[PDB]
Amino acid sequence: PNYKLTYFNMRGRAEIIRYIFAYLDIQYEDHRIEQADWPEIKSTLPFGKIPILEVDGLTLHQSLAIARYLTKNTDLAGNTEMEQCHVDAIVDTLDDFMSCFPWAEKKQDVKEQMFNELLTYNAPHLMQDLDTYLGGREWLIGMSVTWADFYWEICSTTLLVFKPDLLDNHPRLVTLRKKVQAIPAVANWIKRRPQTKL
Amino acid sequence: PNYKLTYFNMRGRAEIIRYIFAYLDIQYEDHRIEQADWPEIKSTLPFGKIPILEVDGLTLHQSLAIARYLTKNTDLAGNTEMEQCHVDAIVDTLDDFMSCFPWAEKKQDVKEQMFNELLTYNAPHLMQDLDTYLGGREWLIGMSVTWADFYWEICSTTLLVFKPDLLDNHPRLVTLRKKVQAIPAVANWIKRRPQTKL
Numbered sequence A, B: 001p002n003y004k005l006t007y008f009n010m011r012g013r014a015e016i017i018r019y020i021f022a023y024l025d026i027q028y029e030d031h032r033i034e035q036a037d038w039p040e041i042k043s044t045l046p047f048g049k050i051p052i053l054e055v056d057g058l059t060l061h062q063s064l065a066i067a068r069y070l071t072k073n074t075d076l077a078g079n080t081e082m083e084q085c086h087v088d089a090i091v092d093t094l095d096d097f098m099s100c101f102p103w104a105e106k107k108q109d110v111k112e113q114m115f116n117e118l119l120t121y122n123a124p125h126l127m128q129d130l131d132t133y134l135g136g137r138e139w140l141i142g143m144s145v146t147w148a149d150f151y152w153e154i155c156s157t158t159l160l161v162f163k164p165d166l167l168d169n170h171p172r173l174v175t176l177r178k179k180v181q182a183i184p185a186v187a188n189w190i191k192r193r194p195q196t197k198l
Ligand SMILES: N[C@@H](CCC(=O)N[C@@H](CS)C(=O)NCC(=O)O)C(=O)O
Pocket: A012, A013, A042, A048, A049, A050, A051, A061, A062, A063, A064, B092, B096
Protein backbone atom coordinates (compact mmCIF):
# COMPACT_ATOMS: atom_id res chain seq x y z
CA PRO A 1 0.00 0.00 0.00
CA ASN A 2 1.03 3.61 -0.62
CA TYR A 3 1.95 5.06 2.77
CA LYS A 4 2.66 8.67 3.68
CA LEU A 5 3.40 9.58 7.30
CA THR A 6 3.17 13.24 8.30
CA TYR A 7 4.63 14.60 11.54
CA PHE A 8 7.06 17.19 12.89
CA ASN A 9 10.81 16.68 12.47
CA MET A 10 11.41 14.62 15.59
CA ARG A 11 10.85 11.08 16.83
CA GLY A 12 7.98 12.09 19.09
CA ARG A 13 4.71 10.24 18.66
CA ALA A 14 5.43 9.18 15.09
CA GLU A 15 8.54 7.13 15.86
CA ILE A 16 6.60 4.01 16.86
CA ILE A 17 5.07 4.00 13.38
CA ARG A 18 8.51 4.51 11.80
CA TYR A 19 9.87 1.48 13.73
CA ILE A 20 6.99 -0.70 12.59
CA PHE A 21 7.54 0.26 8.94
CA ALA A 22 11.26 -0.48 9.25
CA TYR A 23 10.75 -3.84 10.96
CA LEU A 24 8.13 -4.95 8.44
CA ASP A 25 10.30 -3.67 5.58
CA ILE A 26 7.53 -1.41 4.30
CA GLN A 27 8.40 1.60 2.14
CA TYR A 28 6.69 4.89 2.99
CA GLU A 29 7.09 8.65 2.65
CA ASP A 30 8.44 10.02 5.93
CA HIS A 31 6.98 13.52 5.57
CA ARG A 32 8.35 15.92 8.18
CA ILE A 33 6.73 19.35 8.27
CA GLU A 34 8.16 22.60 9.56
CA GLN A 35 6.30 24.47 12.29
CA ALA A 36 5.83 27.30 9.80
CA ASP A 37 3.61 25.13 7.59
CA TRP A 38 1.68 23.50 10.44
CA PRO A 39 -1.13 26.10 10.81
CA GLU A 40 -2.23 25.51 7.21
CA ILE A 41 -2.06 21.71 7.35
CA LYS A 42 -3.75 21.59 10.76
CA SER A 43 -6.87 23.29 9.40
CA THR A 44 -7.35 20.50 6.84
CA LEU A 45 -7.21 17.65 9.37
CA PRO A 46 -10.44 16.25 10.88
CA PHE A 47 -9.00 16.52 14.40
CA GLY A 48 -6.10 18.90 13.84
CA LYS A 49 -3.32 16.76 15.28
CA ILE A 50 -0.35 14.78 14.03
CA PRO A 51 0.90 12.26 13.28
CA ILE A 52 -1.51 11.14 10.59
CA LEU A 53 -0.98 8.32 8.12
CA GLU A 54 -2.33 8.37 4.58
CA VAL A 55 -3.02 4.86 3.30
CA ASP A 56 -3.82 4.62 -0.41
CA GLY A 57 -5.44 8.05 -0.22
CA LEU A 58 -7.27 7.41 3.05
CA THR A 59 -6.24 9.38 6.14
CA LEU A 60 -5.86 7.80 9.59
CA HIS A 61 -4.95 9.60 12.83
CA GLN A 62 -3.79 8.80 16.40
CA SER A 63 -0.32 7.26 16.56
CA LEU A 64 -1.17 4.18 18.60
CA ALA A 65 -4.37 3.48 16.65
CA ILE A 66 -2.24 3.62 13.49
CA ALA A 67 0.50 1.49 15.06
CA ARG A 68 -2.06 -1.18 15.98
CA TYR A 69 -3.55 -1.04 12.49
CA LEU A 70 -0.13 -1.70 10.94
CA THR A 71 0.79 -4.52 13.30
CA LYS A 72 -2.44 -6.48 13.09
CA ASN A 73 -1.89 -9.88 11.48
CA THR A 74 1.89 -9.58 11.90
CA ASP A 75 4.35 -11.18 14.34
CA LEU A 76 4.49 -7.89 16.28
CA ALA A 77 0.89 -8.03 17.60
CA GLY A 78 0.90 -10.79 20.23
CA ASN A 79 0.30 -14.54 19.83
CA THR A 80 -3.19 -14.64 21.39
CA GLU A 81 -6.01 -12.19 22.02
CA MET A 82 -5.02 -12.02 25.69
CA GLU A 83 -1.39 -11.33 24.78
CA GLN A 84 -2.56 -8.73 22.27
CA CYS A 85 -4.37 -7.09 25.20
CA HIS A 86 -1.13 -7.21 27.20
CA VAL A 87 0.68 -5.47 24.35
CA ASP A 88 -1.98 -2.73 24.10
CA ALA A 89 -1.89 -2.25 27.87
CA ILE A 90 1.87 -1.82 28.10
CA VAL A 91 1.75 0.67 25.26
CA ASP A 92 -1.05 2.65 26.94
CA THR A 93 0.74 2.64 30.32
CA LEU A 94 3.81 4.11 28.62
CA ASP A 95 1.73 6.60 26.64
CA ASP A 96 -0.07 7.65 29.83
CA PHE A 97 3.24 8.46 31.49
CA MET A 98 4.83 10.24 28.53
CA SER A 99 1.62 12.25 28.11
CA CYS A 100 1.94 13.52 31.68
CA PHE A 101 4.88 15.70 30.63
CA PRO A 102 3.92 19.27 29.59
CA TRP A 103 5.76 19.17 26.27
CA ALA A 104 3.91 22.22 24.92
CA GLU A 105 4.03 24.28 28.13
CA LYS A 106 5.52 27.72 27.39
CA LYS A 107 5.77 28.55 31.10
CA GLN A 108 9.35 27.39 31.64
CA ASP A 109 9.09 27.36 35.44
CA VAL A 110 5.83 25.40 35.34
CA LYS A 111 7.31 23.06 32.73
CA GLU A 112 10.54 22.42 34.62
CA GLN A 113 8.62 21.93 37.88
CA MET A 114 6.49 19.15 36.41
CA PHE A 115 9.34 17.50 34.50
CA ASN A 116 11.42 17.30 37.66
CA GLU A 117 8.45 16.03 39.65
CA LEU A 118 7.61 13.28 37.15
CA LEU A 119 11.24 12.22 36.71
CA THR A 120 12.13 12.29 40.41
CA TYR A 121 9.04 10.71 41.96
CA ASN A 122 6.87 9.04 39.33
CA ALA A 123 9.46 7.60 36.92
CA PRO A 124 11.20 5.39 39.52
CA HIS A 125 7.85 3.80 40.37
CA LEU A 126 7.09 3.07 36.73
CA MET A 127 10.55 1.65 36.10
CA GLN A 128 10.08 -0.69 39.05
CA ASP A 129 6.67 -1.87 37.85
CA LEU A 130 7.99 -2.46 34.33
CA ASP A 131 11.05 -4.32 35.60
CA THR A 132 8.85 -6.55 37.76
CA TYR A 133 6.46 -7.02 34.85
CA LEU A 134 9.33 -8.07 32.59
CA GLY A 135 10.93 -10.32 35.17
CA GLY A 136 13.67 -12.39 33.59
CA ARG A 137 11.87 -12.73 30.25
CA GLU A 138 13.45 -11.64 26.96
CA TRP A 139 10.55 -9.46 25.81
CA LEU A 140 7.67 -7.70 27.60
CA ILE A 141 4.94 -9.93 26.16
CA GLY A 142 5.28 -13.56 25.13
CA MET A 143 8.46 -15.15 23.80
CA SER A 144 9.05 -12.79 20.88
CA VAL A 145 9.30 -9.07 20.17
CA THR A 146 6.09 -7.04 19.91
CA TRP A 147 5.55 -3.37 19.18
CA ALA A 148 5.27 -2.88 22.94
CA ASP A 149 9.02 -3.53 23.15
CA PHE A 150 9.48 -0.97 20.39
CA TYR A 151 7.49 1.58 22.35
CA TRP A 152 9.53 0.91 25.48
CA GLU A 153 12.78 1.60 23.63
CA ILE A 154 11.28 4.71 22.03
CA CYS A 155 9.81 6.17 25.23
CA SER A 156 12.88 5.36 27.35
CA THR A 157 15.17 7.01 24.79
CA THR A 158 13.41 10.33 25.36
CA LEU A 159 13.22 9.88 29.13
CA LEU A 160 16.98 9.24 29.23
CA VAL A 161 17.57 12.63 27.60
CA PHE A 162 16.28 14.29 30.77
CA LYS A 163 17.19 11.59 33.31
CA PRO A 164 20.38 9.70 32.28
CA ASP A 165 20.40 7.59 35.47
CA LEU A 166 16.79 6.48 34.94
CA LEU A 167 17.79 2.83 34.56
CA ASP A 168 20.82 2.56 36.85
CA ASN A 169 18.89 0.20 39.15
CA HIS A 170 17.35 -1.73 36.24
CA PRO A 171 19.89 -3.55 34.07
CA ARG A 172 17.11 -5.77 32.73
CA LEU A 173 15.31 -2.74 31.31
CA VAL A 174 18.56 -1.56 29.73
CA THR A 175 19.08 -4.97 28.13
CA LEU A 176 15.56 -4.86 26.67
CA ARG A 177 16.40 -1.50 25.07
CA LYS A 178 19.54 -3.01 23.55
CA LYS A 179 17.71 -6.13 22.38
CA VAL A 180 15.33 -3.93 20.37
CA GLN A 181 18.13 -1.74 18.97
CA ALA A 182 19.96 -4.92 17.94
CA ILE A 183 17.15 -6.04 15.62
CA PRO A 184 18.70 -5.59 12.12
CA ALA A 185 15.85 -3.56 10.59
CA VAL A 186 15.59 -1.37 13.69
CA ALA A 187 19.35 -0.84 14.01
CA ASN A 188 19.37 0.25 10.37
CA TRP A 189 16.62 2.79 10.98
CA ILE A 190 18.25 4.17 14.13
CA LYS A 191 21.49 4.62 12.19
CA ARG A 192 19.91 6.54 9.30
CA ARG A 193 17.09 8.50 10.95
CA PRO A 194 17.38 12.29 11.41
CA GLN A 195 19.17 13.12 14.67
CA THR A 196 16.78 15.21 16.77
CA LYS A 197 16.57 15.85 20.51
CA LEU A 198 13.03 14.50 20.84
CA PRO B 1 -14.47 -17.63 31.35
CA ASN B 2 -14.73 -16.09 34.82
CA TYR B 3 -14.44 -12.30 34.88
CA LYS B 4 -13.70 -9.99 37.80
CA LEU B 5 -13.59 -6.23 37.19
CA THR B 6 -12.02 -4.16 39.95
CA TYR B 7 -12.50 -0.41 40.19
CA PHE B 8 -13.80 2.31 42.50
CA ASN B 9 -17.50 2.81 43.06
CA MET B 10 -17.99 5.14 40.10
CA ARG B 11 -18.44 5.01 36.35
CA GLY B 12 -15.07 6.54 35.53
CA ARG B 13 -12.65 4.48 33.47
CA ALA B 14 -14.37 1.14 34.12
CA GLU B 15 -17.73 2.15 32.64
CA ILE B 16 -16.73 1.38 29.05
CA ILE B 17 -16.00 -2.18 30.16
CA ARG B 18 -19.31 -2.35 32.02
CA TYR B 19 -21.21 -1.20 28.89
CA ILE B 20 -19.57 -3.87 26.77
CA PHE B 21 -20.42 -6.65 29.24
CA ALA B 22 -24.00 -5.38 29.37
CA TYR B 23 -24.29 -5.14 25.59
CA LEU B 24 -22.82 -8.60 25.06
CA ASP B 25 -24.93 -10.10 27.87
CA ILE B 26 -21.85 -11.45 29.65
CA GLN B 27 -21.87 -12.14 33.39
CA TYR B 28 -19.03 -10.72 35.45
CA GLU B 29 -18.19 -9.72 39.00
CA ASP B 30 -18.41 -5.93 39.25
CA HIS B 31 -16.07 -5.43 42.21
CA ARG B 32 -16.19 -1.89 43.60
CA ILE B 33 -13.60 -1.02 46.23
CA GLU B 34 -13.66 1.63 48.95
CA GLN B 35 -10.90 4.19 49.37
CA ALA B 36 -9.93 2.41 52.59
CA ASP B 37 -9.32 -0.72 50.49
CA TRP B 38 -6.90 1.04 48.12
CA PRO B 39 -3.58 0.34 49.86
CA GLU B 40 -4.19 -3.42 49.82
CA ILE B 41 -5.73 -3.51 46.34
CA LYS B 42 -3.00 -1.37 44.76
CA SER B 43 -0.36 -3.81 45.99
CA THR B 44 -1.88 -6.38 43.62
CA LEU B 45 -2.01 -4.22 40.48
CA PRO B 46 0.69 -4.60 37.81
CA PHE B 47 1.12 -0.84 37.43
CA GLY B 48 -0.70 0.44 40.51
CA LYS B 49 -3.76 1.49 38.52
CA ILE B 50 -7.35 0.42 38.08
CA PRO B 51 -9.39 -0.81 36.45
CA ILE B 52 -8.00 -4.28 36.02
CA LEU B 53 -9.97 -7.25 34.72
CA GLU B 54 -9.14 -10.73 35.93
CA VAL B 55 -9.90 -13.41 33.37
CA ASP B 56 -9.65 -17.01 34.57
CA GLY B 57 -6.95 -16.04 37.05
CA LEU B 58 -4.89 -13.75 34.81
CA THR B 59 -4.84 -9.96 35.12
CA LEU B 60 -5.48 -7.51 32.29
CA HIS B 61 -5.13 -3.77 32.83
CA GLN B 62 -5.80 -0.46 31.00
CA SER B 63 -9.50 0.22 30.41
CA LEU B 64 -9.32 0.71 26.63
CA ALA B 65 -6.99 -2.25 26.05
CA ILE B 66 -9.51 -4.35 27.98
CA ALA B 67 -12.43 -2.84 26.06
CA ARG B 68 -10.72 -3.66 22.77
CA TYR B 69 -10.06 -7.21 23.99
CA LEU B 70 -13.71 -7.73 24.95
CA THR B 71 -15.07 -6.45 21.64
CA LYS B 72 -12.77 -8.44 19.35
CA ASN B 73 -14.82 -10.70 17.08
CA THR B 74 -18.06 -8.96 18.12
CA ASP B 75 -20.37 -6.55 16.30
CA LEU B 76 -18.99 -3.70 18.43
CA ALA B 77 -15.44 -3.84 17.00
CA GLY B 78 -15.84 -2.28 13.56
CA ASN B 79 -16.55 -4.03 10.25
CA THR B 80 -13.14 -3.61 8.58
CA GLU B 81 -9.50 -3.17 9.59
CA MET B 82 -9.74 0.46 8.49
CA GLU B 83 -12.92 1.05 10.48
CA GLN B 84 -11.39 -0.72 13.47
CA CYS B 85 -8.58 1.84 13.28
CA HIS B 86 -11.11 4.69 13.17
CA VAL B 87 -12.83 3.25 16.25
CA ASP B 88 -9.48 3.18 18.04
CA ALA B 89 -8.65 6.71 16.91
CA ILE B 90 -11.94 8.27 18.06
CA VAL B 91 -11.65 6.52 21.41
CA ASP B 92 -8.08 7.76 21.89
CA THR B 93 -9.06 11.30 20.87
CA LEU B 94 -11.80 11.30 23.51
CA ASP B 95 -9.51 9.71 26.09
CA ASP B 96 -6.85 12.35 25.36
CA PHE B 97 -9.22 15.17 26.23
CA MET B 98 -10.65 13.48 29.32
CA SER B 99 -7.09 12.99 30.56
CA CYS B 100 -6.45 16.75 30.40
CA PHE B 101 -8.63 17.31 33.46
CA PRO B 102 -6.97 17.48 36.93
CA TRP B 103 -9.16 14.78 38.47
CA ALA B 104 -6.78 14.35 41.40
CA GLU B 105 -6.05 18.03 42.10
CA LYS B 106 -6.26 18.57 45.88
CA LYS B 107 -6.79 22.33 45.78
CA GLN B 108 -10.46 22.64 44.82
CA ASP B 109 -10.10 26.26 43.72
CA VAL B 110 -7.41 25.56 41.11
CA LYS B 111 -9.19 22.37 40.08
CA GLU B 112 -12.50 24.14 39.44
CA GLN B 113 -10.73 26.88 37.50
CA MET B 114 -8.87 24.47 35.23
CA PHE B 115 -12.06 22.48 34.66
CA ASN B 116 -13.98 25.59 33.67
CA GLU B 117 -11.21 26.78 31.36
CA LEU B 118 -10.98 23.39 29.64
CA LEU B 119 -14.73 23.13 29.07
CA THR B 120 -15.03 26.72 27.84
CA TYR B 121 -11.86 27.27 25.78
CA ASN B 122 -11.00 23.76 24.59
CA ALA B 123 -14.04 21.51 24.63
CA PRO B 124 -15.84 23.58 21.94
CA HIS B 125 -13.15 22.77 19.38
CA LEU B 126 -13.35 19.05 20.10
CA MET B 127 -17.14 19.09 20.04
CA GLN B 128 -17.09 20.75 16.62
CA ASP B 129 -14.53 18.27 15.24
CA LEU B 130 -16.63 15.33 16.46
CA ASP B 131 -19.83 16.81 15.06
CA THR B 132 -18.16 17.47 11.71
CA TYR B 133 -16.71 13.95 11.73
CA LEU B 134 -20.11 12.41 12.46
CA GLY B 135 -21.85 14.52 9.84
CA GLY B 136 -25.31 13.19 9.12
CA ARG B 137 -24.34 9.57 9.78
CA GLU B 138 -26.17 7.45 12.35
CA TRP B 139 -23.05 6.27 14.20
CA LEU B 140 -19.45 7.49 14.49
CA ILE B 141 -17.98 4.57 12.53
CA GLY B 142 -19.65 2.33 9.97
CA MET B 143 -23.35 1.61 9.71
CA SER B 144 -23.84 0.09 13.16
CA VAL B 145 -22.96 0.93 16.76
CA THR B 146 -19.38 0.35 17.95
CA TRP B 147 -17.76 0.82 21.34
CA ALA B 148 -16.56 4.22 20.11
CA ASP B 149 -20.20 5.31 20.33
CA PHE B 150 -20.35 3.87 23.84
CA TYR B 151 -17.25 5.83 24.76
CA TRP B 152 -18.74 9.06 23.40
CA GLU B 153 -21.88 8.64 25.50
CA ILE B 154 -19.79 7.75 28.55
CA CYS B 155 -17.34 10.67 28.26
CA SER B 156 -20.02 13.22 27.40
CA THR B 157 -22.12 12.07 30.35
CA THR B 158 -19.30 13.09 32.67
CA LEU B 159 -18.48 16.31 30.82
CA LEU B 160 -22.13 17.37 30.94
CA VAL B 161 -21.97 17.18 34.73
CA PHE B 162 -19.52 20.09 34.70
CA LYS B 163 -20.71 21.83 31.52
CA PRO B 164 -24.48 21.32 31.05
CA ASP B 165 -24.56 23.40 27.85
CA LEU B 166 -21.65 21.45 26.32
CA LEU B 167 -23.81 20.16 23.46
CA ASP B 168 -26.27 23.03 22.97
CA ASN B 169 -24.60 23.82 19.64
CA HIS B 170 -24.47 20.16 18.61
CA PRO B 171 -27.87 18.44 18.50
CA ARG B 172 -26.46 15.64 16.33
CA LEU B 173 -24.08 14.64 19.13
CA VAL B 174 -27.03 14.66 21.53
CA THR B 175 -28.98 12.38 19.21
CA LEU B 176 -26.04 9.97 19.16
CA ARG B 177 -26.07 9.88 22.98
CA LYS B 178 -29.79 9.11 22.98
CA LYS B 179 -29.39 6.27 20.47
CA VAL B 180 -26.74 4.61 22.64
CA GLN B 181 -28.89 5.14 25.73
CA ALA B 182 -31.82 3.62 23.83
CA ILE B 183 -30.10 0.27 23.16
CA PRO B 184 -32.09 -2.13 25.42
CA ALA B 185 -29.13 -3.81 27.15
CA VAL B 186 -27.42 -0.46 27.68
CA ALA B 187 -30.63 1.24 28.85
CA ASN B 188 -31.12 -1.51 31.44
CA TRP B 189 -27.57 -1.10 32.74
CA ILE B 190 -27.88 2.68 32.89
CA LYS B 191 -31.08 2.32 34.93
CA ARG B 192 -29.70 -0.24 37.40
CA ARG B 193 -26.07 0.81 37.86
CA PRO B 194 -25.06 2.47 41.15
CA GLN B 195 -25.68 6.23 40.91
CA THR B 196 -22.40 8.06 41.37
CA LYS B 197 -21.26 11.55 40.42
CA LEU B 198 -18.39 10.34 38.21
N1 LIG C 1 -2.53 11.11 21.33
C1 LIG C 1 -2.27 11.65 20.01
C2 LIG C 1 -1.52 12.99 20.19
C3 LIG C 1 -1.86 14.04 19.10
C4 LIG C 1 -1.01 15.30 19.43
O1 LIG C 1 -1.23 15.97 20.45
N2 LIG C 1 -0.07 15.62 18.52
C5 LIG C 1 0.75 16.82 18.68
C6 LIG C 1 2.21 16.53 18.29
S1 LIG C 1 3.08 15.48 19.49
C7 LIG C 1 0.27 17.89 17.70
O2 LIG C 1 -0.49 17.61 16.76
N3 LIG C 1 0.35 19.14 18.18
C8 LIG C 1 0.11 20.33 17.34
C9 LIG C 1 -1.18 20.98 17.79
O3 LIG C 1 -1.84 20.44 18.73
O4 LIG C 1 -1.53 22.00 17.16
C10 LIG C 1 -1.43 10.67 19.15
O5 LIG C 1 -0.85 9.73 19.71
O6 LIG C 1 -1.39 10.89 17.85
